[PDB]
């Protein structure tokens, strides 16, 4: 079994997956809504009690077994081998999500090389009728049906969304995105096709350049006027907002998707080295660097919005209420062309925004490809090079659902359910199966023999009491209120919202299906058939 090299590459491989383009969307979009500083406090509380233990449980688990996401559960508890399949099916939906978004950013990177960024002037290709974004000396008014150049650019020059009317009527394919999407799967191919041993050198650059680019972007917006208003708008706490349950759920939700346990990717990474006496030091740095990186991430966005909000004669609130991505692709794009230093930072941000996605997209396929290959050695022994091509082409048709059907109607619908209770259901059962049925005394034993030290009686208290309660809380939060959402003055109908629920519901049907499958073929009586499936090893 191949092993990995320097300890740090590991740390660059995991943090590159830990931080992605999602953190640039949701983290700054959710904080000020939940009170800014009033959201960072529960974000830190739940990160200590909820974030780290589910994060290191998965890394410590792959450390000892070294079996992936499917074959590992033959050793933990045989009744839970369907988790790896559930990760694979859910991965197919998240693989599409992520891969199409970068095509929208790669459309900007190729276009951003031009000195005249087509983001401020509705020149001869836009819906110029509702276009006005030059805030002159009070000879203008903004109507409700009015838009800006960047709103139209993400609207009818990325999505071409006017071609289609909704989920009930879907359009064609954009030729520009059709070339952008293939280049994305090209680099995703060679990064994993060469082998996990070579992917450590791909993350060497992609996991470090964003941290440079954050500094490249932070110094610009910080030195301009208005930054004091932007930072103040973000960090000024709204304490009474913390008393609402929505703040605590969002704080617990952010740490989960920020760290990303239960997705099988962290589990696969720990399966490629013993990590003698160094795993607890590696995982703990990721959780804090991930939380500090997201803090710096949103700190750059509002720092740039502050310079605009001084120019815009308004508050940063009530600005781009539409959605996370629609905010970033439009609003932050406007600021680049409005900063005097344009033609350079258009490349820097939308080279890291792709790199944050690519690095995190490289890591995604490794979790799936590690899982299936550990089960089928007749594929890993000779077809490991061909198996990657089957997944990349499989992910290509997965991503094609968005492009040739008109625009983002599939993405936002797939957003709310592809990463919904399914990934939390997986993350829950991974915690329950490893702790309750598989004796946590044995898991604490398996880890402390590898690390030369045991973290028991602190983490354990959190693992058996705090972890199932605060993972079931996120489940119980979702069944109460249906998120009737919108996209650009178009409310989604009822049948599509149930379809997204059906896709998200069926995404984790593997774990009841597999348990039902084994209990039928297993011989014995009702009690004996259940013990054979639960019996570890």
């Amino acid at each position, epitope marked *: 079994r191949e092993t990995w090299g320097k300890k740090v590459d590991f740390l660059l491989s995991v943090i590159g997956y830990a931080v992605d383009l999602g953190n640039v969307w949701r983290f700054p979009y959710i904080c000020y809504q939940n009170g800014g500083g009033a959201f960072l406090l529960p974000y830190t509380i739940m990160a200590i009690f909820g974030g780290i233990p589910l994060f290191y449980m998965e890394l410590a688990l792959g450390q000892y077994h070294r079996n992936g996401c499917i074959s590992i559960w033959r050793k933990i508890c045989p009744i839970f081998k369907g988790i790896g399949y559930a990760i694979c099916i859910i991965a197919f939906y998240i693989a599409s999500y992520y891969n199409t978004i970068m095509a929208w950013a790669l459309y900007y990177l190729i276009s951003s090389f031009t000195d005249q960024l087509p983001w401020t002037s509705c*020149k001869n290709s836009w*819906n110029t009728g509702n276009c006005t974004n030059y805030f002159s000396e009070d000879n203008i008014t903004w109507t409700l049906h009015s838009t800006s150049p960047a709103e139209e650019f993400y609207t009818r020059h990325v999505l071409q969304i006017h071609r289609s009317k909704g989920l009930q009527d879907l359009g064609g394919i954009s030729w520009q995105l059709a070339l952008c999407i293939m280049l994305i799967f090209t680099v995703i191919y060679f990064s994993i096709w060469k082998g996990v041993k070579t992917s450590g050198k791909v993350v060497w650059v992609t996991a470090t350049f964003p941290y440079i680019a954050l500094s490249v972007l932070l110094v610009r917006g910080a030195t301009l006027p208005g930054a004091w208003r932007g930072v103040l708008f973000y960090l000024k706490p709204n304490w009474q907002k913390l008393l609402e349950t929505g703040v605590w759920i969002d704080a617990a939700a952010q740490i989960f998707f920020s760290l990303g346990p239960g997705f099988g990717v962290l589990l696969a990474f720990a399966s490629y080295n013993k990590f003698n006496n160094n795993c607890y030091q590696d995982a703990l740095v990721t959780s804090v660097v991930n939380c500090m990186t997201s803090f710096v991430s949103g700190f750059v966005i509002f720092t740039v919005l502050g310079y605009m909000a001084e120019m815009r004669n308004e508050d940063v609130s009530e600005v781009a209420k539409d959605a996370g991505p629609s905010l970033l692709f439009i609003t932050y794009a406007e600021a680049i062309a409005n900063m005097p230093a344009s033609t350079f930072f258009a490349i820097i941000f939308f080279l890291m925004l792709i790199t944050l996605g690519l690095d995190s997209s490289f890591a995604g396929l490794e979790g799936v490809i590690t899982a299936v290959l550990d089960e089928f050695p007749h594929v890993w022994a000779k077809r490991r090079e061909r198996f990657v091509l089957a997944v990349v082409i499989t992910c290509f048709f997965g991503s094609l659902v968005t492009l040739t059907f008109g625009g983002a109607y599939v993405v936002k619908l797939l957003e709310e359910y592809a990463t919904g209770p399914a990934v939390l259901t997986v993350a829950l059962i991974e915690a329950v199966a490893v702790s309750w049925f598989y004796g946590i005394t044995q898991f604490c034993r398996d880890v402390k023999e590898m690390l030369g030290f045991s973290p028991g009686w602190f983490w354990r208290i959190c693992w058996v009491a705090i972890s199932p309660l605060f993972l079931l809380f996120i489940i119980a939060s979702f069944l109460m209120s249906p998120p009737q959402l919108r996209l650009f003055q178009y409310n989604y109908p009822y049948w599509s919202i149930i379809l997204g629920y059906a896709i998200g519901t069926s995404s984790f049907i593997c774990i009841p299906t597999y348990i039902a499958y084994r209990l039928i073929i297993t011989p014995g009586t009702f009690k004996e058939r259940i013990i054979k499936s639960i019996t570890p090893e």
Partner: antibody
Amino acid sequence: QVQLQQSGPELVKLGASVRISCKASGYRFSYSWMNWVKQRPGKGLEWIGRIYPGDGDTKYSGKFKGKATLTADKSSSTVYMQLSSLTSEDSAVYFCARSAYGSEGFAMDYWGQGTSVT
Amino acid sequence: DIVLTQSPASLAVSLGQRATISCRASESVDNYGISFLNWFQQKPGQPPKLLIYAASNQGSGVPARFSGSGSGTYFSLNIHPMEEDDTAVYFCQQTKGVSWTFGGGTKVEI
């Protein structure tokens, strides 16, 4: 009501220069393209140039790049097409047009009275 | 640059008969789902009045007799039974940059 008002006609000497005006009024001229077209007696139309008031960017074709210069001023609500090195081939009337917004295909909505450059 | 052509050069449209005027091109003008080809109207001494938006939608102050349709490299200005008052030359524009070009023009009269 919207209208486009040009200047009056002007006689041309061989190698001289003229300066046609076109005042916009009744709409957001600073967010549309101001066009210019030839109407030669006996032939069809021939596009000359185009400009966006507010930015100053211009686009030319049909060999008019070596004969025409075009500018605009957002504070005066006018667009001024300048022409040099005129000759008998340039004997024709020139029109000013408001480009419709791009969602409708930039169909030139309203027109000026036209001015004779001969 | 996009080159536009038209035919027949002169249509002998008798009073009360249908008329159709084509606009052929090298491109491939369909961009962003909006047909970047339009139609105008000239009379002697009159401005080039607008006829059709995007080769399919009637214009402001334009009678309902004039309409169009098509896709790709070939459109047609389908016109209801004309009268003598509709004596005018019709021109085909293309508004797909870099350059905006015009057609040769066809004389459609009684």
